Design a protein around this ligand. Structure first.
Ligand code: HEM
Ligand SMILES: CC(=O)N[C@@H]1[C@@H](O)[C@H](O)[C@@H](CO)O[C@H]1O
Ligand SMILES: *[C@@H]1O[C@H](CO)[C@@H](O)[C@H](O)[C@H]1NC(C)=O
Lengths: 96, 79, 94, 108, 371, 100, 95, 80, 94
DNA sequence: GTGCCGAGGCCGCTCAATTGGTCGTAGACAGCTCTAGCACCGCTTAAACGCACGTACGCGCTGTCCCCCGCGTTTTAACCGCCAAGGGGATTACTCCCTAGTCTCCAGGCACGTGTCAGATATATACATCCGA
DNA sequence: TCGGATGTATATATCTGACACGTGCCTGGAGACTAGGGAGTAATCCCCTTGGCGGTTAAAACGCGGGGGACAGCGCGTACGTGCGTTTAAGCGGTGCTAGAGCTGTCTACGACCAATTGAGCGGCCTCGGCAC
C-alpha cells in the first residue's frame, strides 16, 4: 500500500509531461451540442470546431486550477476548496 | 439530456493534477462543471452568432477561433 | 482657428429630451463625448472585421446589427437592435 | 431645388447621420459604406446615450442636485449590471468608488 | 361564411336597449364586458376564429387525438401566442426602453417565491388607456377609404351596440379602422375626451356617466393610498408644496389646480397623479405608472408556471415556430383582409406608408406538432 | 400538471389558492379609511382627511380633466391598436364583481 | 476620551468612499513623473492635463489593487493586509 | 532625486482606506511604492514613444490616453 | 480545388536556414502560420492607428518601427528593429 | 525488432509580382505668431512627522475526527472499423440595384462674447453615534 | 443601560465663475446626375456530416479501510491604531520669459494606376523512412 500523496504526485508528474486531452471526446461533443441547441436548432458541427472547443476549455480549466492552487496555498492549505475557485474568478474579473 | 454529467470526476481530477493540484475536495466538481458550462455557453453563443451572420447552418472551426479571439483567448493551430 | 468637431450639441439635445430641467457640466460632457467615440470605434471595428471575414467589401446594416449583438451585453443589445431597425425602416419610408 | 432637410430629421433621430457617415468613410473601415449603416449606428449611439443620461439624471435628482457631475455618471454606470459589464475596463475621471464595506470588518 | 361569437341570454339586457328595432342581443365570451363597443366584439370574434382555425389545422395534421386534446392544445397555443404578442410588442411601447429594461429583465426560469396575484392598485394604475380613447369610431372600406354609410360614428352611439357588427358588414371595416387610425396623444392640458366624460352609456342609462370621476370614486372605494404614498413606494421623491409639485409634474398651472383641489399631494388620487406626470421617453406612462405596471407584469411572468419560455412547456422546435407569430399575420389568416401593416402593428397608423400586401410574411409552421 | 386548470388553482405547490379565481386582491400598502376600518372617504360630510377637506371627485374631473375637444392632438407613433390591445389584456387580467 | 481601535478606521473608510478628490499631493506626483520620464528623453515638457491623467490612472489602479488585496487578506481569515496578499493578487491578475 | 518618497505613508493609507482596507501592515508602503513606480514607468515609456514618433517635445494628454488604452485601461475625461 | 495562400514555404526555408537536418510536422506548420498572421495583423493595426493619430494617410517605415517598439517586449524589439533597418538599407542600395 | 502512414521531393499550370511611364496630391521644407509651460518669490497653514500606550490581532501549539486517497471488482460505454444517405458548403454566370465621384448651393454647427444663478464656503444648530458605568 | 462627549448632516447667508444663450460666418452636408463593378439569385457538384452496427476493452462506479489534514480552542507578545505636540513644504496668488505648437505657402517627388509579361507557388502525385507499437 502507498501512503496518501504519493500516487497524486506521480499523476501530477505524468499528466504534466503528456499533451493528450483529458476529457472524453464523445461526452464533450454531446454537451457542446446540448448547449448549442438553445441558440439555434438543427445545427451542424465540424470535427475541428469541437476539437478547438475542447482544447480551449481544457486550457482554461487548467489555468483556473493553477490559480485555485495558488489561492489554497495562500490560505495555508493543501486541499482545493470552492472558495478558492470563487476568489480566483473574482480577482481575475470573470465573476466580478 | 443531462450530458453536463458526462464530465466525470476522474476527468476533473486529471485536469486538476495537470494544474499541479495535490489534494481535491469532493465539493468542487459541481463548481468546475458550472464554470465549464458558463464558458462553453459564452463561446458557443459567439460562434453561433458568427455562423448566423454568414447565412450558414454549419459551425466551422474558423467561427470558434474568431469567437475565442474576440474574448482575448487566441487559439493557434486551427486557422 | 481650426474647428473641433464633437458630440456636444447632440448629447445636450438628448439630455433635454430625457431630463428637460437638468444641466450638465464640462467634465461630464467630455466623458460623454469619449464614451460615444469609444462605442463608435468598437462597433465600427467589429463591423469591419465581420465584413473582412466573409470576403465582402461593403458595410451594411446587417454587419452593424451583428456587431451590436456581439458587443452589447444582454437586454441592452436587444433593445439597441430594435432601435436600429426602428430607424432604418423609417429612413426607407421617407 | 427642393428645400434641404437633414438625414437625421428623416430618420427621426437627434444624432448626426451625415457626420457618422463621413466618419465611417474617412475612418478606413471598409472600401464601401452602405446607406443604412449610418442610421443604425446613430440610432444605437442615441439609445445608449439616452439610457446613461437618464440613469445619471435619476442619480442627480436622488442627490438633490440639478446638474450632472462625473460622480453621478460613475454611480449610474456602476449601479447597472449591463452598463457595468459594457464599461468594465473603463476608468471615469472624478468618479470615486461605489460605497461598500465587507461584512467581516463590521463590528458585532 | 366565417364564425361569429355565440349569443347570450340574460334576465335583463342593457345591451338590447340601444336598438329596439334590431332585436339583436349581444354575444357571450369569456368575459361579461365583451360588448362595450364593436371593437371588443370584433377582437373576441377574431380570437374565436383563430382558435377554430388552429383546432381544424391540428385535427387535419393529427387525426388520432380526441376532441378534448384538440381543444386543450389549441387553448395552450392561443395562450402562448397572446403572451408572446403582449410581452414582445405592447409593453415595450407602454413602459419605454428604460423602464422595460429596468422592470422586465431577461427571463431565466420559473420562481415559486413570487406572488402572481393581481394587486389592488393595478385595477386603477392600468386605467391609463382611458386617456387614449378617440372621440369617434372609424370604419374603412377595402381601399382604406371612408366607407359609407357613417364613415365616422360618435362614440356615444356605439356603446353596447352589437347590431353594428352583425348587420354592418362584419368586423373587417372595424379592424381596418383600428389598424389605420392614429390614437390620441395624452397631454397635460388634454387628459381625456368629453365623449367618455359626459356621454358615457347615454342610451343605456337614464343619464350619462363621467369615466374619470368613476375612476376616482372607485379608487377611493378601494381605499387606495394617495399619490405621495405610492411615489414613496416606488422610490420616487415625494412633493410637499406647490413648487415641488410643479417641479415633479414639469407644469405650474396643473400643479396649481391640483393644490387648489386637494391642498396636499398626499390627498391626490392615484389615477390623476399617474396620468398627470410627464410621459417617459418613447413611452406612454409616467414614472409611477411605469413602476407599478412593470412590477405587476414581472410578478405575473415570473410566477407563471405555464410560461411559454419555461422548460418542459414547449419543445425547442415549437418555441422557434411560435417565436415567428405576429398580430398582422393572424389578422390576415382569419378574415377577408388583404392589406395589413408592417411589424409592430401598434406603431403603424398611416396608409399606405407602412402597409404591406401580407402575401410575403411567413405563416405559423405547425409541422413540429406531429405526434 | 400537463394542462392549465380553468379556475387556475393548484398552480403553486406551496399555496394552491395563490393566483386562483374569486379571491381577494393584494394590498401593497395598508388601506386608508376615514374611520380606519371600512368607511371610504367622502361618506360622512364634514370629515377632514390629513387636516384638509375631502375634495369632490366630480368637481376635480370637471375643472381639470375637461378640455375643449377641438384641440385634440393625434398621436404620431401610436394607433387604436394600442388602446384596443390594452383593453383586451386588462379584461384578461382582472375583474371586480359588484352588487347589482 | 479615546475611541477603540478600528472605529476611526471605519469612519475614514466611509469618508473617503464618498469623496471624489485626489488622495496624492500634486507636486510630489508631478516631480516623480518628471524624474521617471527623465530616464527616457532629456529636456521633456509636460502638459498639466497629462500629469492629471497620469495621477487619475495611478489612483484608480492603486484603489483596485487595494480592493483585491483586501479580498485576498480576508480569504486567509485575517484583517491586516500584508505584502503577500499584494503579490498574490498581482500574480493572479497576470502582472 | 529620490522623489519616490513623495508618496507619503498617509497618502497610501488614504488610498487603502478608499479601497475598504481596515488594518494595514507596516511593510505595505514599500511594495505599494514599487508597484506604482513600475506602472508609471510602463505608461510614461509608452507616452514618450508616442510623443517621439510625432517629433514633438511636450507629452500631451492624448499620448497618455493612448498609452492607457494600449495597456487596456481606457480613461474617460481627457481628450477623446 | 482553389488556391489557398499560406506562409508554408517561407517558414520551411527559414527552418532549413536554422536547422538544415530538422523537419516540421503539419500541426507545427499550422501553428507557425497562425502566429505569423497574428503578429502581422497586430503590427499592421498598430501602425494604422499611429498613422491615424498623426493625421497621416501613409504607412511608412517610421510607423512600422514605432509599432514594433510599442508591441514587441524587451530586447527582442530592439533586435527586430535592427533587422528591419538593415533590410530597408539593403533595399535602398539595390 | 517492425511495418506504415506521414513528411518530403517533382511536374503543370495559372494567377499574381514585375518592369515601364504618368500624374496629381501628400508631405517636407521655411517663416511667423502667440499660447502656455517653466521658473521664482512670499504667506499661510493644512499636511506630514515623531512619540508614547496598550489593546486587539497574527501566530504558534495540541487535539480529534471525518473525509479523501488508495485498492480491488464488477460494469458501462468510449472507441475503432465499416456502410449508406443526403444536407448543404463551394463554384459560376448574369445581370440589377447600389454606391462612388463631381458641381452647387446653402444652412448647421463651430468660435467668441455675456450675464446670471447653481453651488462651494462660513456658522450655528440639532441629531446620530460611541465608550463607559 | 442612562448619560456625556464628539462627529456630522442640516438650515441660513454670500459671493462667484462657468454654463446656457446669442450672433456671425464658413465649410461640410444635401441635391441632382452619371458610370461601373459588387453581390443577389438561380443552377450544379461533390463532400463530409449524421446515423447505425458490432466487438474489444479501457476507463468510470462503487465499496471498504485508515491516516492525515481541517478546523477549533488557547495562550502570548507585539505592533499598529489613536491621540498629541512640533516641523515643513503644499497650495495660492502674482509676475515675467521664451520654447515650441500651430498655421500659412510652395513645390516636388513618390505612390497609385494603367498594361504586357512570365515565373512562383499551389495542387496533385508518388516515395521512402521516423516512429508508435
Ligand atoms: C376605451 C373605452 C373604455 C371605456 C368606455 C371603459 C369603461 C369602463 C367602465 C364603465 C368600467 C367600470 C367602472 C369604471 O371603472 O369606471 C371599466 C373598468 C375598467 N377599465 Fe375601462 N373602459 C375603456 C377602456 C379601458 C382600457 C383601454 C383600459 C386599460 C388599458 C381599461 C381599464 C379598466 C380597468 C382596470 C377596469 C377595472 C375597474 C374595476 O374593476 O372597478 N379600460 N371600464
Ligand atoms: C336611431 C337608431 O338607433 N336607429 C336604428 C338604425 O340605425 C338601424 O339601422 C335600425 C335597424 O337595425 O334600427 C334602428
Ligand atoms: C424568487 O424571488 C425571490 C423574491 O424576490 C428571490 O429572493 C429569489 O431569489 C427568487 N428565486 C429564484 C430562483 O429566482
Amino acid at each position: 500500500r502507498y501512503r496518501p500523496g504519493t500516487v497524486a504526485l506521480r499523476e501530477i508528474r505524468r499528466y504534466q509531461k503528456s499533451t493528450e486531452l483529458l476529457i472524453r471526446k464523445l461526452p464533450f461533443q454531446r454537451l457542446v451540442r446540448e448547449i448549442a441547441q438553445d441558440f439555434k436548432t438543427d445545427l451542424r458541427f465540424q470535427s475541428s470546431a469541437v476539437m478547438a472547443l475542447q482544447e480551449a476549455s481544457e486550457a482554461y480549466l487548467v489555468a483556473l486550477f493553477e490559480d485555485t492552487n495558488l489561492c489554497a496555498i495562500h490560505a495555508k492549505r493543501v486541499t482545493i476548496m470552492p472558495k478558492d475557485i470563487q476568489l480566483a474568478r473574482r480577482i481575475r474579473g470573470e465573476r466580478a | 439530456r443531462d450530458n453536463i454529467q458526462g464530465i466525470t470526476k476522474p476527468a476533473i481530477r486529471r485536469l486538476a493534477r495537470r494544474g499541479g493540484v495535490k489534494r481535491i475536495s469532493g465539493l468542487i466538481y459541481e463548481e468546475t462543471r458550472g464554470v465549464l458550462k458558463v464558458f462553453l455557453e459564452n463561446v458557443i453563443r459567439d460562434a453561433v452568432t458568427y455562423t448566423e451572420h454568414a447565412k450558414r447552418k454549419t459551425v466551422t472551426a474558423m467561427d470558434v477561433v474568431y469567437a475565442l479571439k474576440r474574448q482575448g483567448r487566441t487559439l493557434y493551430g486551427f486557422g | 482657428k481650426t474647428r473641433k468637431e464633437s458630440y456636444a450639441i447632440y448629447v445636450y439635445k438628448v439630455l433635454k429630451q430625457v431630463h428637460p430641467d437638468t444641466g450638465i457640466s464640462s467634465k461630464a460632457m467630455s466623458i460623454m463625448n469619449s464614451f460615444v467615440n469609444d462605442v463608435f470605434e468598437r462597433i465600427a471595428g467589429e463591423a469591419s472585421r465581420l465584413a473582412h471575414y466573409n470576403k465582402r467589401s461593403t458595410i451594411t446594416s446587417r454587419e452593424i446589427q451583428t456587431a451590436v449583438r456581439l458587443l452589447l451585453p444582454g437586454e441592452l443589445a436587444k433593445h439597441a437592435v430594435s432601435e436600429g431597425t426602428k430607424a432604418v425602416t423609417k429612413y426607407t419610408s421617407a | 431645388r427642393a428645400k434641404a432637410k437633414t438625414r437625421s430629421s428623416r430618420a427621426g433621430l437627434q444624432f448626426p447621420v451625415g457626420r457618422v457617415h463621413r466618419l465611417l468613410r474617412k475612418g478606413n473601415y471598409a472600401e464601401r459604406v452602405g446607406a443604412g449603416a449610418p442610421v443604425y449606428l446613430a440610432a444605437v449611439l442615441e439609445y445608449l446615450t439616452a439610457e446613461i443620461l437618464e440613469l445619471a439624471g435619476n442619480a442627480a435628482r436622488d442627490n438633490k442636485k440639478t446638474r450632472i457631475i462625473p460622480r453621478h455618471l460613475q454611480l449610474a454606470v456602476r449601479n447597472d449590471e449591463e452598463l457595468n459589464k459594457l464599461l468594465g475596463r473603463v476608468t471615469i475621471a472624478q468618479g470615486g468608488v461605489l460605497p461598500n464595506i465587507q461584512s467581516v470588518l463590521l463590528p458585532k | 361564411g366565417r364564425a361569429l361569437l355565440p349569443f347570450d341570454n340574460l334576465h335583463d339586457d342593457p345591451c338590447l336597449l340601444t336598438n329596439r328595432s334590431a332585436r339583436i342581443p349581444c354575444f357571450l365570451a369569456g368575459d361579461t364586458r365583451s360588448s362595450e363597443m364593436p371593437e371588443l366584439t370584433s377582437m373576441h370574434t377574431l380570437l374565436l376564429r383563430e382558435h377554430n382555425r388552429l383546432a381544424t389545422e391540428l385535427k387535419s395534421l393529427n387525426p388520432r387525438w380526441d376532441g378534448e386534446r384538440l381543444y386543450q392544445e389549441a387553448r395552450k397555443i392561443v395562450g402562448a401566442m397572446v403572451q408572446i404578442i403582449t410581452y414582445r410588442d405592447y409593453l415595450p411601447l407602454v413602459l419605454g426602453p428604460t423602464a422595460m429594461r429596468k422592470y422586465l429583465p431577461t427571463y431565466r426560469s420559473y420562481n415559486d417565491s413570487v406572488d402572481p396575484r393581481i394587486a389592488n392598485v393595478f385595477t386603477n394604475a392600468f386605467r391609463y388607456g382611458h386617456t387614449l380613447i378617440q372621440p369617434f369610431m372609424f370604419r374603412l372600406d377595402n381601399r382604406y377609404q371612408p366607407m359609407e354609410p357613417n364613415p365616422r360614428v360618435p362614440l356615444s352611439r356605439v356603446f353596447f351596440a352589437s347590431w353594428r357588427v352583425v348587420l354592418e358588414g362584419g368586423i373587417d371595416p372595424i379592424l381596418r379602422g383600428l389598424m389605420a387610425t392614429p390614437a390620441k396623444l395624452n397631454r397635460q392640458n388634454q387628459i381625456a375626451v368629453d365623449e367618455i366624460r359626459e356621454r358615457l352609456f347615454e342610451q343605456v342609462m337614464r343619464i350619462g356617466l363621467d369615466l374619470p370621476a368613476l375612476n376616482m370614486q372607485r379608487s377611493r372605494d378601494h381605499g387606495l393610498p394617495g399619490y405621495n404614498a405610492w411615489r414613496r413606494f416606488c422610490g420616487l421623491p415625494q412633493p410637499e408644496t406647490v413648487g415641488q409639485l410643479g417641479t415633479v409634474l414639469r407644469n405650474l398651472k396643473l400643479a396649481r389646480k391640483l393644490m387648489e383641489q386637494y391642498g396636499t399631494p398626499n390627498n391626490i388620487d392615484i389615477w390623476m397623479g399617474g396620468v398627470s406626470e410627464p410621459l417617459k421617453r418613447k413611452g406612454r406612462v409616467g414614472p409611477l405608472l411605469a413602476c407599478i405596471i412593470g412590477t405587476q407584469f414581472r410578478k405575473l411572468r415570473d410566477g407563471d408556471r405555464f410560461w411559454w419560455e419555461n422548460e418542459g412547456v414547449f419543445s425547442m422546435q415549437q418555441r422557434q415556430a411560435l417565436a415567428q407569430i405576429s398580430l398582422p399575420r393572424i389578422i390576415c389568416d382569419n378574415t377577408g383582409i388583404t392589406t395589413v401593416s408592417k411589424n409592430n402593428i401598434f406603431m403603424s397608423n398611416s396608409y399606405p406608408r407602412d402597409f404591406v400586401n401580407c402575401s410575403t410574411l411567413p405563416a405559423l409552421n405547425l409541422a413540429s406538432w406531429r405526434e | 400538471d400537463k394542462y392549465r386548470t380553468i379556475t387556475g388553482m393548484c398552480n403553486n405547490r406551496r399555496s394552491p389558492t395563490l393566483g386562483a379565481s374569486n379571491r381577494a386582491f393584494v394590498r401593497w400598502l395598508p388601506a386608508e379609511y376615514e374611520d380606519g376600518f371600512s368607511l371610504p372617504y367622502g361618506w360622512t360630510p364634514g370629515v377632514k382627511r390629513n387636516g384638509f377637506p375631502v375634495a369632490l371627485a366630480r368637481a376635480v374631473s370637471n375643472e381639470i380633466v375637461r378640455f375643449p375637444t377641438d384641440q385634440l392632438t393625434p398621436d404620431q407613433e401610436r394607433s387604436l391598436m394600442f388602446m384596443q390591445w390594452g383593453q383586451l389584456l386588462d379584461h384578461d387580467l382582472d375583474f371586480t364583481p359588484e352588487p347589482a
